Amino acid sequence: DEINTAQDKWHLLPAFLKVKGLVKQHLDSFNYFVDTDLKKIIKANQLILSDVDPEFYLKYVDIRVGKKSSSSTKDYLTPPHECRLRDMTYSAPIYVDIEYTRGRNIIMHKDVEIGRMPIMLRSNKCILYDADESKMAKLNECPLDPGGYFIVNGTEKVILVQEQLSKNRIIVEADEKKGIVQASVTSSTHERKSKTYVITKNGKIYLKHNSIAEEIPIAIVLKACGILSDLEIMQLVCGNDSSYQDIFAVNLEESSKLDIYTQQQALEYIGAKVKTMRRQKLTILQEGIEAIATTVIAHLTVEALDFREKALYIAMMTRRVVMAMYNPKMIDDRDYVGNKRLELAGQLISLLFEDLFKKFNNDFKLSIDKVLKKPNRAMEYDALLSINVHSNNITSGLNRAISTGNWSLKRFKMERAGVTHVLSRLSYISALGMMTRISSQFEKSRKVSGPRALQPSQFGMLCTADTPEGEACGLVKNLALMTHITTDDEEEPIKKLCYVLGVEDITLIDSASLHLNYGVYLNGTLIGSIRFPTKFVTQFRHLRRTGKVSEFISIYSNSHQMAVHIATDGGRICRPLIIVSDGQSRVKDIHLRKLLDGELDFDDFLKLGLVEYLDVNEENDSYIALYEKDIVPSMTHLEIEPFTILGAVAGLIPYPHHNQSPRNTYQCAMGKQAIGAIAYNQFKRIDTLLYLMTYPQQPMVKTKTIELIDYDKLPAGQNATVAVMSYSGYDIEDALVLNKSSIDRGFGRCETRRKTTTVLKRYAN
Amino acid sequence: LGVPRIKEIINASKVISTPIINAVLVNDNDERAARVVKGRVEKTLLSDVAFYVQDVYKDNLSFIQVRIDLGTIDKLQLELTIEDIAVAITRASKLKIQASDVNIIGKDRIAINVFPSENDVFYRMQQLRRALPDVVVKGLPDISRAVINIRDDGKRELLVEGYGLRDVMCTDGVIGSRTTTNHVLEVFSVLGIEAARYSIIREINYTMSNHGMSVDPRHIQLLGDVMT
Amino acid sequence: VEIAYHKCDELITLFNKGELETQPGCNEEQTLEAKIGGLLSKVREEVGDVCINELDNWNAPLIMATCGSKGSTLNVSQMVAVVGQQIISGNRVPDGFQDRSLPHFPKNSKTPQSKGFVRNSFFSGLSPPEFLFHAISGREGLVDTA
Amino acid sequence: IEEFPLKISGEEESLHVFQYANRPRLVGRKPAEHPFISAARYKPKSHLWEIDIPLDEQAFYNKDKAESEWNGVNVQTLKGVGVENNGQYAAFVKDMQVYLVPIERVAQLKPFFKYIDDANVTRKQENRLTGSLLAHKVADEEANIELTWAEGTFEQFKDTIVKEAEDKTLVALEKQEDYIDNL
Amino acid sequence: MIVPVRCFSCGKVVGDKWESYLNLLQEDELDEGTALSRLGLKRYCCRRMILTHVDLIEKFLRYNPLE
Amino acid sequence: XXXXXXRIEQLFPVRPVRVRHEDVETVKREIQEALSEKPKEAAAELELLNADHQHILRKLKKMNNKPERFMVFQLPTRLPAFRELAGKVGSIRVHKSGKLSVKIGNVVMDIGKGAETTFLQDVIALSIADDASSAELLGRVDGKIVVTPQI
Amino acid sequence: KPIRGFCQRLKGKQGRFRGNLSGKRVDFSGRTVISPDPNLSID
């Protein structure tokens, strides 16, 4: 039969899922961690030095997980099922190369293990990578098992995907009877802080930093950041609009109210308010302290004497404030999906390992100082017995953080709980749904229902029915079926490309013409302005479709806020979409014929420019068709399959569009509690609790989802002969009538297996 | 009208969200009958009838000139032209900074003069210009807004979104005999503890009558009696 | 429904090209909202009335609703004729995207389909936008209860 | 349907651009008067521009306040650091040909109140420090590189630019397909 | 796990038809419907007992611990 | 604009150009060139781009022999291979119907106007000699030029 | 600040008053799932 694009474009979903499984956020994040972020930590903390014995150093040259240079193979890892059975941690050793100086001018390498790295299941370092169900049989592992969790002390722990507001981005919010505050939570690789920004009174605009004693008025900081003309201030923050001028003039007047200002007068004013630095470098208490204050006021770290970038950033901050004060509804929804980011297991473990490695290096330097403080016979030979003994701390911390879920990061200074949860083994669907589960940010003031409502902007990105009941109702969310999470890619080669494509740098731009053209933002920062914003957007999109820039960069244009926005950061949620050009789809069923024939795996639809990822923000600029039949020649994309708006669990529902939505939500709840088949190795497993159906049947009415997630291979239920009638009076209020002699013949017959573990502990005596 | 309303009533909180004062009138007409009372209860009217405000300087004299438009003051039914506007300006700019002599050159072009550690004159003139088109000339400065309502008849009652019940009760053209507010503590301080318990009972009953909650009124009576 | 959609889009084009008669109690932007919502509610009520009047004697939902044991004529009409209008926070579904509810509609479009009106019944099945709008409406009811 | 050639030149020329944000290009129909320049300064190793333009004395000077508040106010100082940007090429037309010269460190000049600085310091009178701290440390430690503003010599520069623009001629070979990836 | 001996609803023996149904599917291929009708499974309960069965025991035997 | 709050006209006090909120967008496009007055999201862009070609060609014609006018050109920072790059690079061509193009190398690009600079611009020469450091003035910029590669 | 003093014993939902004085756990009580029974008298 000839391929019909309308009803065969759905095969792009199985094509996408073959190479990008449902448990892929965790997988890719952990692979990225262990492959590049470990090198990044070891290259940040590359050398440790001592005050004494200057002719001596320790160098961290290389870092590796699970492999040595002695043999081509990796080390033997006790398989994850054996780790589960023996209540140990599925971990691979971290090997480093050490350059420690010998007293007789000798230079050597080494392969020294500094701890065990808890390895995520089915990652690159995991032994179950690319196994053919035969090695899985030999390893007593289920081929259908999701992977993407950790076995620490024999318990399956999953680092849930974390929801949080996007960092390094301006958010503006109003309020009633209090004023307008709008922050920019800026996070560096070593210091996180939020540059708060509120209107105290009289329409006066202030900058409120934690390190600053009192909120510095806005004209003062604007004059401090090089913009000291006090007309270009009003030009940058006000443009040519008449209302904003009088809205803003009060804090212009205040600038002269105190004393007329040069740049350095404002800089001294800022510096007078810096709190403290734990009484180190006391000789910096001068006008120069404001330089560090402004350097550590945001992410726009300045390493020179030009303050234009930070000045324009603060001017946009102010102008958004002024827009909000002129009229509300210029604020951003804090629950808009475009304003959130998803931290993943790899990023979490990256920061945790960075903290643990800093502790390890501090303690190693302490031990080295204690050893080498001795006057005589300072033999250098075998100076690594300490690190051989001292390797236990990295492993202990790395295991315990995952085991307990509490992550005590001294450097970044917060205590978070519930980062990990025990992977649920009630059902195969329960485990798979604990994967692809998102936990929202706490300290949210649960008394209100902003981040509890379902948003129209989560269409196709977060499942529209898989939201749990009772207390965390709307706080825990689930990923949709056909979704990707962007990864952090370098921003510097895209700024150059933007300059090539006609964007003129802000340092080339004057204040009086800034709000007359569209301004191009890179990750929320005004890098410049451009004529022809729509042409720039089209050329950028053409470059991305031709693969000249990463497919995950998002470009969209805001008309109310005259801006072309380009986003490159990781954590943005995106989904693939068929590109509709000139009123026609780009797939045209020859690509579909190739795809079912075997050629053109899903990646090639991206290399060919037929399919592109859209995040929530680009969906503002897009116009998607649900079906090929209603493609009007003004639409920009076409849905691959609209049933992907439901997650894995909600795909168990037959005909969900014929139900009231609460019924779909409740089935999303109960399907994870359904009793059935767990895994192909369920009788080899020994779990704290396990419910198994004796005679599980696959549903007679299934969906595409349940066969895309192999639910028909381990089903949880049975096809009961049902008569819908009133009977016996014992069926009122949800009560059921069960056939005796169906129960006799095995209908509904299940069993429970419970484990009891004891250890014959040896004692001191 | 829900859990927060019942909470407010039984907590006897002094500040409530949406305190509504229901005021019945004496006559039956819109033009020049009920709009007059509505104007008699209004928040602020300077900006409403200023039509501009000036920042005027000369060789040695400074004017804050405002040209009150008789057209707005006539179309919007209010009783004020110049003198009460001037005295209200004096009171408000005294509460802000100072006001000793507010002059009227005539023809609705009332001008305010400022005279006196430097540039303070210009700063105070600017702040007076900013705080000028916000002052109250007509109406009680307790009512955020008034709104004429219809009780499915030809009777145009008005209920005000304010915190002053005695003023609305004593306002001309409002029948004080039938004029109740939904603020129990406002009823208590103006009418008495018996009227306070009546207001409590009526407010609670009405609150649960808008949710279909069929409670015998004796329970509400006992609640009011134990509260008062 | 086609007659109702026609009046709705006529009011849409009037509001867009010019200025409608703003209601006394509410400003311009929501007077179109009130007019469109009233018209859609009227068409839903009339279609449901026709469905109920054509319902069969010995219809099980009709009997349960008539005797009051379970359900109602609203539930029957939503199952059979039309799930009328998804109302969240007291009005139609607001813009989830920039000046727009879903990217599957034109920008600054206020057609009944774009702002929550579910033409379908639960018998015929909900089209993907209508399904999402219904989900938000149900979530709105479930929210606040906690 | 014509062709206009552009030619690169000025390989060694240090051609800076001044961006006087303090004054408009043209107040009226005609271009604004180019202000007189005197006592211009540049700080190497810092790329700091200081340019002095005297104030008019016949009108709007406030001489009494000027001398009573600050000792030297006759000149007006516009200060702005040159910012190194690439791809900015300065052009002119001579013989139906546009001659390009690369621009080094455009600067944005804003008024500078050094007399207010000195009055404030005279009032107040009675450790790697790297990073932005090191930038200002360098600026106020290694400084005082006086420049001599010699205005008027355009013809030498223009005939020179033509000299490197006609003697040298180079052809291009890079594939268009390769250029797109080179972007 | 393994095909139930009897249909849950009727009690008709269907555990002696699993292998015959599999052989009808593989050797001399038939449709599932006609293969169920060939075995004598007339009632839809006996039909679903075989049509919806998932033979998980063959997958569990891949982990036999006493080889 | 809207209502403006009313020896040398350039020494008179300067007030910002103020436009009402109800019409900020319309006057915005008018004053983008009117503030200089030098001596639909696709069609509008293309027509204003064609106007940019007509203005750019007008300026090149009036810059043919003036000994003071300069333009700043925005070229890509990585030009096609042929900085130590000297000589003739290519041509700026005038196509039919008023549109222009630039052939920097073997490639063909388009040429636009970029942002307008409503303030004084002047070019100078830096020659810091060990004998004598001197700064030399050359001319004044009349407009920015942006050339963009096209795929 | 997890240190549990005397006033911590008395304050709270699970404190002393609201947890043991007014409301406590009782003997001779049971709890299980409820099922319907029409042949049971309403009392």
Place this chain on the structure above:
Amino acid sequence: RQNRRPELGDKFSSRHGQKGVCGIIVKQEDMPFNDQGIVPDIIMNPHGFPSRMTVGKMIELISGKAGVLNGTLEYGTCFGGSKLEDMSKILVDQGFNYSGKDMLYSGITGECLQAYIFFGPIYYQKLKHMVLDKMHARARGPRAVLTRQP
């Protein structure tokens, strides 16, 4: 390991949010039967349908019946799935009513039921909440040391 028979109070659900415990377990002969002697494993109240408005469950019953009669597993995908007209055509072709409503006889009286009964297979899941792990009863026993309460 502990085998568990489904008993009174065990919770079951049917993929449409329609959960509920076993109210009664009745003998097969007391159950209603059709012409072929097919007898239901589960009887579920019609009163659960009108208010919950789970038309998807009815369509699932009909599609499952047509699927078992046709020898093929059906599809109930969101915004798609097997059309109801096709399933009704399969049902009519095999001798059943198009609407999945068969005439049953009473198991206890033997007479025809005066209403046609929605009859067919529905996927039912047994939920982890069993009454054996919830039944708890205390008369006297362990007491808190500090408060001397149960």
Place this chain on the structure above:
Amino acid sequence: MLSFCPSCNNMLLITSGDSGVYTLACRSCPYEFPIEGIEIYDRKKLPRKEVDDVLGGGWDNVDQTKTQCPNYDTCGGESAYFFQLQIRSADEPMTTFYKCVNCGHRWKEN
């Protein structure tokens, strides 16, 4: 005011000098714009804030349904305004709130 100097572009202010001259001196820069019989006026428009008509009622635009109110003996109302909310757990059905068009009596039929 909102005016700025031509030299340093800082915001201009009014200062009282000798003979009480209200000159527009620019702080931080020797600039002096005196007043010689010249009027500096800054006019900004203010809104008219027209009248607002009676609030009345727009109950014609509210979804009705065919339900007889509990107070049928007093008022024979066959219609009732409604709106449905799910104020139960997601396993109970939705709740419908009513309001009789003949008396205004509200009730919830669940």
